[PDB]
Enzyme design. Structure first.
Site, PDB file in Angstrom:
ATOM      1  N   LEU A  70      -9.415 159.585  -6.073  1.00  0.00           N
ATOM      2  CA  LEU A  70      -9.311 159.063  -7.439  1.00  0.00           C
ATOM      3  C   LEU A  70      -8.748 160.154  -8.347  1.00  0.00           C
ATOM      4  O   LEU A  70      -8.096 159.853  -9.348  1.00  0.00           O
ATOM      5  CB  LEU A  70     -10.671 158.589  -7.975  1.00  0.00           C
ATOM      6  CG  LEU A  70     -11.384 157.463  -7.243  1.00  0.00           C
ATOM      7  CD1 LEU A  70     -12.784 157.313  -7.761  1.00  0.00           C
ATOM      8  CD2 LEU A  70     -10.641 156.146  -7.363  1.00  0.00           C
ATOM      9  N   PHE A  86     -11.352 172.150  -8.425  1.00  0.00           N
ATOM     10  CA  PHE A  86     -12.734 171.798  -8.042  1.00  0.00           C
ATOM     11  C   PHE A  86     -12.842 171.275  -6.594  1.00  0.00           C
ATOM     12  O   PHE A  86     -13.816 171.560  -5.889  1.00  0.00           O
ATOM     13  CB  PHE A  86     -13.326 170.766  -9.042  1.00  0.00           C
ATOM     14  CG  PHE A  86     -12.673 169.397  -9.070  1.00  0.00           C
ATOM     15  CD1 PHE A  86     -13.237 168.324  -8.386  1.00  0.00           C
ATOM     16  CD2 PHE A  86     -11.500 169.180  -9.787  1.00  0.00           C
ATOM     17  CE1 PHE A  86     -12.631 167.063  -8.406  1.00  0.00           C
ATOM     18  CE2 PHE A  86     -10.894 167.918  -9.805  1.00  0.00           C
ATOM     19  CZ  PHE A  86     -11.462 166.869  -9.114  1.00  0.00           C
ATOM     20  N   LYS A 126     -17.710 163.884  -5.551  1.00  0.00           N
ATOM     21  CA  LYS A 126     -16.962 165.095  -5.805  1.00  0.00           C
ATOM     22  C   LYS A 126     -17.063 165.923  -4.511  1.00  0.00           C
ATOM     23  O   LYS A 126     -18.161 166.301  -4.109  1.00  0.00           O
ATOM     24  CB  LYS A 126     -17.562 165.828  -7.016  1.00  0.00           C
ATOM     25  CG  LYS A 126     -16.711 166.960  -7.562  1.00  0.00           C
ATOM     26  CD  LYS A 126     -17.342 167.534  -8.835  1.00  0.00           C
ATOM     27  CE  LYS A 126     -16.744 168.864  -9.219  1.00  0.00           C
ATOM     28  NZ  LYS A 126     -17.651 169.649 -10.099  1.00  0.00           N
ATOM     29  N   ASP A 129     -18.663 171.089 -22.133  1.00  0.00           N
ATOM     30  CA  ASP A 129     -17.348 170.509 -21.734  1.00  0.00           C
ATOM     31  C   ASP A 129     -17.249 169.059 -22.228  1.00  0.00           C
ATOM     32  O   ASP A 129     -16.843 168.158 -21.490  1.00  0.00           O
ATOM     33  CB  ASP A 129     -17.110 170.593 -20.213  1.00  0.00           C
ATOM     34  CG  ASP A 129     -15.644 170.560 -19.793  1.00  0.00           C
ATOM     35  OD1 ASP A 129     -14.754 170.624 -20.695  1.00  0.00           O
ATOM     36  OD2 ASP A 129     -15.380 170.419 -18.574  1.00  0.00           O
TER      37      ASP A 129
HETATM   38  C1  LIG Z   1      -5.234 161.648 -18.883  1.00  0.00           C
HETATM   39  N1  LIG Z   1      -5.844 161.792 -17.538  1.00  0.00           N
HETATM   40  C2  LIG Z   1      -7.123 162.217 -17.489  1.00  0.00           C
HETATM   41  O1  LIG Z   1      -7.687 162.455 -18.507  1.00  0.00           O
HETATM   42  C3  LIG Z   1      -7.995 162.437 -16.359  1.00  0.00           C
HETATM   43  C4  LIG Z   1      -7.670 162.265 -15.007  1.00  0.00           C
HETATM   44  C5  LIG Z   1      -8.683 162.518 -14.053  1.00  0.00           C
HETATM   45  C6  LIG Z   1      -9.979 162.916 -14.495  1.00  0.00           C
HETATM   46  N2  LIG Z   1     -11.062 163.132 -13.709  1.00  0.00           N
HETATM   47  C7  LIG Z   1     -11.217 163.704 -12.532  1.00  0.00           C
HETATM   48  O2  LIG Z   1     -10.307 164.201 -11.919  1.00  0.00           O
HETATM   49  C8  LIG Z   1     -12.574 163.697 -11.985  1.00  0.00           C
HETATM   50  C9  LIG Z   1     -13.089 164.859 -11.409  1.00  0.00           C
HETATM   51  C10 LIG Z   1     -14.382 164.816 -10.895  1.00  0.00           C
HETATM   52  C11 LIG Z   1     -15.140 163.656 -10.940  1.00  0.00           C
HETATM   53  C12 LIG Z   1     -14.638 162.488 -11.516  1.00  0.00           C
HETATM   54  C13 LIG Z   1     -15.433 161.235 -11.584  1.00  0.00           C
HETATM   55  C14 LIG Z   1     -16.764 161.349 -11.577  1.00  0.00           C
HETATM   56  N3  LIG Z   1     -17.518 160.253 -11.675  1.00  0.00           N
HETATM   57  C15 LIG Z   1     -18.839 160.106 -11.708  1.00  0.00           C
HETATM   58  C16 LIG Z   1     -19.058 158.807 -11.813  1.00  0.00           C
HETATM   59  N4  LIG Z   1     -17.908 158.131 -11.867  1.00  0.00           N
HETATM   60  C17 LIG Z   1     -16.926 158.999 -11.765  1.00  0.00           C
HETATM   61  C18 LIG Z   1     -15.531 158.876 -11.753  1.00  0.00           C
HETATM   62  N5  LIG Z   1     -14.971 157.615 -11.877  1.00  0.00           N
HETATM   63  C19 LIG Z   1     -13.638 157.214 -11.921  1.00  0.00           C
HETATM   64  C20 LIG Z   1     -13.401 155.842 -11.903  1.00  0.00           C
HETATM   65  C21 LIG Z   1     -12.081 155.374 -11.955  1.00  0.00           C
HETATM   66  C22 LIG Z   1     -10.994 156.262 -12.001  1.00  0.00           C
HETATM   67  O3  LIG Z   1      -9.708 155.798 -12.027  1.00  0.00           O
HETATM   68  C23 LIG Z   1      -9.269 154.744 -12.860  1.00  0.00           C
HETATM   69  C24 LIG Z   1     -11.221 157.667 -12.020  1.00  0.00           C
HETATM   70  O4  LIG Z   1     -10.125 158.562 -12.077  1.00  0.00           O
HETATM   71  C25 LIG Z   1     -10.274 159.953 -12.222  1.00  0.00           C
HETATM   72  C26 LIG Z   1     -12.559 158.101 -11.981  1.00  0.00           C
HETATM   73  N6  LIG Z   1     -14.849 159.988 -11.657  1.00  0.00           N
HETATM   74  C27 LIG Z   1     -13.356 162.505 -12.036  1.00  0.00           C
HETATM   75  C28 LIG Z   1     -10.224 163.058 -15.847  1.00  0.00           C
HETATM   76  C29 LIG Z   1      -9.271 162.843 -16.777  1.00  0.00           C
END
Ligand SMILES: CNC(=O)c1ccc(NC(=O)c2cccc(-c3cn4ccnc4c(Nc4ccc(OC)c(OC)c4)n3)c2)cc1
Lengths: 5, 274
Positions: B15, B20, B40, B132
């Site tokens: 995803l 990290f 993670k 954060d």
């Molecule tokens: C403009 N771009 C962004 O801002 C941007 C891009 C990606 C990310 N974050 C991450 O790399 C990331 C890193 C570590 C953990 C998670 C984490 C944790 N959790 C705990 C519970 N649910 C989640 C959870 N759900 C989730 C559900 C649907 C998604 O896709 C539509 C999705 O995509 C990242 C995450 N993710 C995320 C932050 C900002």
């Protein structure tokens, strides 16, 4: 861009 | 806290990924139901093993938190790599969501930022500092239900102190940090209130990056001159004033989350009435 040291 | 790898099923698509490691969708067999999870997974190749120490620190903070507006940890698992298993928030990061859903109404944004303040009011009450707090770390369960995530920089406050003193300036989200954090390395809940003001700006700007085109040092310089980011287009004036209040330079005069949450709560009730 986001995390700066 | 320790999970059974046999009870965990992972999908192959990531995803998200980075320094990290990676994040994957999966399922975890509970007592009866099966639970959709976000996992993670640590990089492993780039062991460190600082990554492992911070993952267990993150797990330790998450285990102590119990609030509807905070991401719940299912547990940890040591297998192919160390894994942090969390309850999935299906819609993902708030900034990503809003960039793809520009039709979201101001009332709905007020509803989501209010939910973030309720979780932050609980974190403040628990004497935990987030460190954060940003739109990227707000995760959506539905379009009407936000949760706070990412406790990788979080600290449990000592019984005798109001803040956490870092010794060295690390890899920091500078654009979300209050002047006391940059200038004295001091992190309190009022420091998170500053970050909350930036998060509010991001949400009302539909996930736009704050202080666009600027370096952290130029932001610090701008903030010293008493200059603040302008009001986002379509943002209610009452929300912009709340943002500027969160951006009180002197920590001693900045509101805390109980005051921030109350202001958001009353304004939401006013908006609901029409
Ligand atoms: C403009 N771009 C962004 O801002 C941007 C891009 C990606 C990310 N974050 C991450 O790399 C990331 C890193 C570590 C953990 C998670 C984490 C944790 N959790 C705990 C519970 N649910 C989640 C959870 N759900 C989730 C559900 C649907 C998604 O896709 C539509 C999705 O995509 C990242 C995450 N993710 C995320 C932050 C900002």
């Amino acid at each position: 861009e986001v995390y700066e040291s | 806290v320790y999970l059974d790898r046999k009870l965990l099923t992972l999908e192959d698509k990531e995803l998200g990924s980075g320094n990290f490691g990676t994040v994957k969708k999966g399922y975890y067999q509970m007592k009866k139901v099966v639970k959709t999870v976000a996992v993670k997974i640590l990089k492993n190749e780039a062991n460190d093993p600082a990554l492992k120490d911070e993952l267990l620190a993150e797990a330790n903070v998450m285990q102590q938190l119990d609030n509807p507006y905070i991401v719940r940890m299912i547990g940890i698992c040591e297998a192919e790599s160390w894994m942090l298993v969390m309850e999935m928030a299906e819609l993902g990061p708030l900034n990503k969501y809003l960039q793809q859903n520009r039709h979201v109404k101001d009332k709905n944004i007020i509803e989501l930022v209010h939910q973030v303040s309720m979780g932050m009011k609980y974190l403040e009450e628990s004497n935990f500092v987030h460190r954060d707090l940003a739109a990227r770390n707000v995760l959506l369960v539905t379009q009407h239900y936000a949760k706070i995530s990412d406790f990788g920089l979080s600290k449990a406050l000592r019984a005798d102190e109001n803040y956490y003193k870092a010794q060295t300036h690390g890899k920091w989200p500078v654009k979300w940090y209050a002047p006391e954090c940059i200038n004295y390395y001091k992190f309190s809940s009022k420091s998170d209130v500053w970050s909350f003001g930036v998060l509010m700006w991001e949400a009302f700007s539909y996930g736009q990056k704050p202080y666009r085109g600027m370096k952290g040092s130029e932001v610090t310089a701008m903030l010293e001159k008493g200059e603040r980011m302008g009001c986002p287009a379509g943002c209610p004036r009452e929300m912009y004033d709340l943002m500027n209040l969160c951006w009180t330079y002197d920590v001693e005069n900045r509101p805390g989350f109980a005051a921030v949450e109350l202001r958001l709560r009353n304004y939401y009730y006013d908006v609901v009435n029409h």
